[PDB]
Amino acid sequence: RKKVRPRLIAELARRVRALREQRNQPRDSQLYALDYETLTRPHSGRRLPVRAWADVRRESRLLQLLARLPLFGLGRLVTRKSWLWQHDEPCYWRLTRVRPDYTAQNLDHGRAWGILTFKGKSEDTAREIEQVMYHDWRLVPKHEEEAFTAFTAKPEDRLNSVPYPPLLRAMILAERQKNGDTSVQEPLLNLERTRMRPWDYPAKQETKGRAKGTPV
Amino acid sequence: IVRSSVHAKWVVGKVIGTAMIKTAKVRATRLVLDPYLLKYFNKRKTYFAHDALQQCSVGDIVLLRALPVPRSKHVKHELAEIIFKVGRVIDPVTGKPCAGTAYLESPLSEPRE
Amino acid sequence: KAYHGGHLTIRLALGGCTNRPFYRIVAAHNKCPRDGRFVEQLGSYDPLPNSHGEKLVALNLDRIRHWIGCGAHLSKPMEKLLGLSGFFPLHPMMITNAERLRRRRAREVLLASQKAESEAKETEAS
Amino acid sequence: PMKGRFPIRRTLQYLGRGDVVFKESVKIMTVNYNTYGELGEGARKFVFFNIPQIQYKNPWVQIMMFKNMTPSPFLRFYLDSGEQVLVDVETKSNKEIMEHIKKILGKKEETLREEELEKQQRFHPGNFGPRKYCLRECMCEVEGQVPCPGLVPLPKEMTGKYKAALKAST
Amino acid sequence: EHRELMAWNRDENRRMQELRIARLQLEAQAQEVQKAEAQAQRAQEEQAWV
RNA sequence: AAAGGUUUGGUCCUGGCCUUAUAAUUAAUUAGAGGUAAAAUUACACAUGCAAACCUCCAUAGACCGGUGUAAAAUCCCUUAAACAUUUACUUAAAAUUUAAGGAGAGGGUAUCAAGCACAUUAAAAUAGCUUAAGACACCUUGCCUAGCCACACCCCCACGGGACUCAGCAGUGAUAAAUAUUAAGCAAUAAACGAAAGUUUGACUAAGUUAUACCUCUUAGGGUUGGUAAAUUUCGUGCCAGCCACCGCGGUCAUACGAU
RNA sequence: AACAUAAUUAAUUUCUAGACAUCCGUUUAUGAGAGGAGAUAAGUCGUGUAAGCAUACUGGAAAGUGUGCUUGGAAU
Ligand code: FES
Ligand SMILES: [K+]
Ligand SMILES: [K+]
Ligand SMILES: [K+]
Ligand SMILES: [K+]
Ligand SMILES: [K+]
Ligand SMILES: [Mg+2]
Ligand SMILES: [Mg+2]
Ligand SMILES: [Mg+2]
Ligand SMILES: [Mg+2]
Ligand SMILES: [Mg+2]
Ligand SMILES: [Mg+2]
Ligand SMILES: [Mg+2]
Ligand SMILES: [Mg+2]
């Protein structure tokens, strides 16, 4: 070959473009700003879904609650209106760290960390909280913490093993007879190893994407 | 001790040049089938080999071992062995010096020199 | 094409002619075209009844198990096919749709009886 | 008339008659033979008749031949482990040489058969597709299945053109 | 199996080496007799030539 | 190729051209309907409409599908390594998908392109080497490797920047060309995107429209040819004129060769 | 050019800015001017010193002559 030649302009463009992104990174106060008259984000023009309209006017964001508290409410318990309606068992975050967005003129945007207790079961380590910019958060009062966090676990009643599908069960029993294994035991699937979290279980905020800084 | 990527893990060739320092230029030949004629011809390739001791001379048959990491752009082999030295061949079957199709030292004798 | 991102999937590739559909069950990267590059053919589905009135599905159940064990997703039509065969449990929407059809025919039967009763009133009027 | 002596050597059938398929260890086979002499006749015939067959079945093995360098003809194989197998072919017929190398460094019939079957594992007769890869392109070819509309017109009720007309009529 | 075949090969090389030494020995005996006769003719011719 | 016609005064040899077979496009003449397949002058300029959403806010997707053959001897096959903008399992191992560095072998034309001019090794930093008639270097041309792949995405190889500022998505238009499909319907099927989901979206696709370009099934009959090659001519007109031929040739008054019949 | 701020949750800023302005040279064509080789085909006056090859001189320019070579002439 040897007629393939360098592309300096492409190399220059890639680096230069990446540099500009770092310099002009947007802030949470800008990416997640909202115009409540139209329920549309000015930065991108994205109109919120219809099922979120009632709560955007009727509920508060997390750091709106925490900005009014000493130390940004470290140690306080916070729950979500969506959880309160869906799950009878206590669901809340125990706040451990909180990084407000200082640029915001009301310190109403930022990031938070805490220990999750979902449906009465508590995680062992603190991780970043997702959906902090949602209008769904409710601070728990200190005098009501003991009654709110009271939970007694019920014995688990979801089956631990189930039958095999009709065809796959016959193929298992047929192989037994072929190999000389004589038994009338029923093949059983074990569901303990593969049990699914609820769909609304908090997800990993650390591995989540962030929107770009190019305005529409 | 992973081996090289190159296909030629072991190549035999003739030393066609030795003017580079500690490197011997070696010409290997392989047989390639002509598809139209269905006859084999010789395709020759050049291999640079690391001659650490500069013990190679033009015209001697040598065995090269693929280096694990390429020493340079072209030096990707080392001198494993000198199968036949130019003018100084030693018969493999009998072990006696030979000069062409003849024995410089008879195989009946046992000089042990 | 040189795909970046995506996963292997088991899906139906449409073949045949106009008004004559025929499907090839294949394992393919999800970003590939429907009838384009695939990894393995895992069977075939002929959706038109044959002379005996039988819709014919062929499943390479050894290779299907291999690719599900390696992360291959399943398309919803293929999840329905495995449920009818008995290799998978019946899909939730297969059961729901069967219930909807039962509720929809019950209304029709009731309406026909009401119409017959209304027709009976016409018979009474003579 | 095909050029050269023994033009049968330049036919695919002759090249495929070779039975020496070397083990994966074999990497190089040097052939040292003499062009003049009486005890090296089999070696000369081996280069003339057999070397093409060996190369045809072992394309990745380097066969390099040297002439009139030693008093006697011999074969030296270089293996991937670094071992060197010397064979002495003086006073040996070309057929004898082939049988000797087949025994010491040739794959057995059992091993070769297993490789052939493994190669064809992914061809299935039931699979449908182009003629190059499959027996049948479409299920219409199978007997009893609905035939292709191109060859045989479909019933009107099985056609989207007809179904659309009824829906409009409804 | 590889080791056994590589041992059989060395035995074949030794068996053929033994035959080579036997054949070459016979040649030395015959060629020696011919050389002695040829040297005699040279001695006769050389004396005559002198 | 199972061959044939055609150099001569004649025979033989040599040798080119042409005929007979098969297919695609366009054109002349002609033509009913039905089923299917395909749709194609142009990397020239484009009016208008549509082609990417989803969703309890965050995200995910719009990196695909679809289009064109721009550039480049561009590639094929194979090895090693590492990843992914992934998947699914484990909190660590099986895949799909790529990327980078390579090389057993194979890979368009011109040699009136015969030299290239740093194209090498060593690793105290010296040595003077490296490729090349076994085709280097230069130039020219072309998508190939075909279940598909590769390159391109208004132009400046690239795209910070700049410019002459976007249909090479579907349909459609101007110009150009021997070359001429609907400014159409539906997301019911399959595929893709999104969502936990009922579901939503899609000019992908599906079912249609258009066209003797092909095949199939049928029903009307039209088109060409009639010296030889090579199947098949009656009368009359013309008179080296008018015309004809793929090749050999024909026509100057009995033309099976031109025109009508 | 690439520092420093901060630090009893921890983060911020930095993660640069100059310079391509454009070549030398390189290919394709418009093509004054002047020939060359063809096509249409009747003219033009000429044309026995064996022929040809190489070369030289002279011929308004087929040829003639010198020198060597060849028989693809003739020669009892
Ligand atoms: S090719 Fe099978 S339906 Fe047409
Ligand atoms: K001829
Ligand atoms: K002639
Ligand atoms: K481009
Ligand atoms: K649909
Ligand atoms: K006529
Ligand atoms: Mg969600
Ligand atoms: Mg046409
Ligand atoms: Mg595509
Ligand atoms: Mg091009
Ligand atoms: Mg020239
Ligand atoms: Mg354009
Ligand atoms: Mg571009
Ligand atoms: Mg268009």
Ligand SMILES: [Mg+2]
């Ligand atoms: Mg576009």
Ligand SMILES: [Mg+2]
């Ligand atoms: Mg057309």
Ligand SMILES: [Mg+2]
């Ligand atoms: Mg999903």
Ligand SMILES: [Mg+2]
């Ligand atoms: Mg007449």
Ligand SMILES: [Mg+2]
């Ligand atoms: Mg004719």
Ligand SMILES: [Mg+2]
């Ligand atoms: Mg006529």
Ligand SMILES: [Mg+2]
């Ligand atoms: Mg002359």
